[PDB]
Amino acid sequence: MQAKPQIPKDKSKVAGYIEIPDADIKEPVYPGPATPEQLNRGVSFAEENESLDDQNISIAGHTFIDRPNYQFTNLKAAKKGSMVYFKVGNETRKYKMTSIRDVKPTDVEVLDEQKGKDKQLTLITCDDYNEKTGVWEKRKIFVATEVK
Numbered sequence: 001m002q003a004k005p006q007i008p009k010d011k012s013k014v015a016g017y018i019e020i021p022d023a024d025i026k027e028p029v030y031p032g033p034a035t036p037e038q039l040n041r042g043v044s045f046a047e048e049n050e051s052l053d054d055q056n057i058s059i060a061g062h063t064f065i066d067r068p069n070y071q072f073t074n075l076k077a078a079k080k081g082s083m084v085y086f087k088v089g090n091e092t093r094k095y096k097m098t099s100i101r102d103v104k105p106t107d108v109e110v111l112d113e114q115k116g117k118d119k120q121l122t123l124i125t126c127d128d129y130n131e132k133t134g135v136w137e138k139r140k141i142f143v144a145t146e147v148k
């Protein structure tokens with residue numbers, strides 16, 4: 001049998017599986033802190049807390065250009081009323097993409113963050129990425145709130 005997984009630093013393990021049927025997405029999420037390298041290899045958490053038991057789950061990723069091998073390349077299809085399945089081991093947590101918008105760069109304080117939240121996965125999918133100069137023309141923020 002299995003159990004509730006924890007969030008380690010090792011990026012070889014899978015703590016959760018991100019599955020979005022509308023976008024045919026079925027990709028492993030790489031648990032741990034955010035590192036520039038790993039965020040170019042797949043999707044990892046932005047939260048420094050090893051707790052996936054918390055209601056605030058921030059995950060970071062990158063958009064698609066020439067490479068369809070990014071875990072959210074087809075995220076363009078998914079709508080604000082689709083189903084985001086965050087599978088932790090065997091437990092399937094369904095979230096709805098209630099809050100979707102692609103905002104402008106520079107301003108990280110475009111939205112006010114607080115600890116008064118619901119169960120939401122806060123995915124930071126930068127809709128651009130030049131590693132050379134370290135720039136991105138857009139940050140597409142996607143917040144999925146837990147459904148029952």
Ligand SMILES: *Sc1ccccc1C(=O)NCC(=O)N[C@]12C[C@H]3C[C@H](C[C@H](C3)C1)C2
Pocket residue numbers: 108109110111112113122124125126136139141
């Ligand atoms: S998209 C990207 C890629 C690499 C480094 C940094 C970023 C980036 O733009 N991140 C900043 C960011 O999204 N900041 C937050 C701050 C608050 C309010 C929003 C949602 C979340 C908590 C991340 C924007």
